[PDB]
């Protein structure tokens, strides 16, 4: 039902398992236990990743889809997180 994703600075993000599976990496890691550590992703990035999971699930097979806001100054970190997570 829920999984816990732990950022490099120790914040714990508790997310619906179905939403976390947006990440190919999380899916493979969970294939059982429900906790995953991301020792190279800080909480200001992982929090945004979790918002993406929610948004991705809510708007799949959508009508016009609202913008996912990404400030330029975190775009590169977000990209590297999304590379690692495969989402």
């Amino acid at each position: 039902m829920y999984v816990k994703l732990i950022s490099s600075d120790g914040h714990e993000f508790i997310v619906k398992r179905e939403h976390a599976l947006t990440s190919g990496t999380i899916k493979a890691m969970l294939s059982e236990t429900n906790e995953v550590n991301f020792r190279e992703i800080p909480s200001h990035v992982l929090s945004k990743v979790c918002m993406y999971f929610t948004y991705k699930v809510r708007y799949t097979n959508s009508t016009e889809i609202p913008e996912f806001p990404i400030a330029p100054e975190i775009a590169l970190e977000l990209l590297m997180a999304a590379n690692f997570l495969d989402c």
């Binding site: 991705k56 799949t60 996912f68 330029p72 775009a75 999304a82 590379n83 989402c87």
Partner: peptide, 16 residues
């Protein structure tokens, strides 16, 4: 229609 993956969205945030 589904949202683009986050890899592509993060790229567009700097490319466009």
């Amino acid at each position: 229609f589904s949202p683009l993956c986050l890899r592509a969205l993060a790229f567009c945030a700097l490319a466009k």
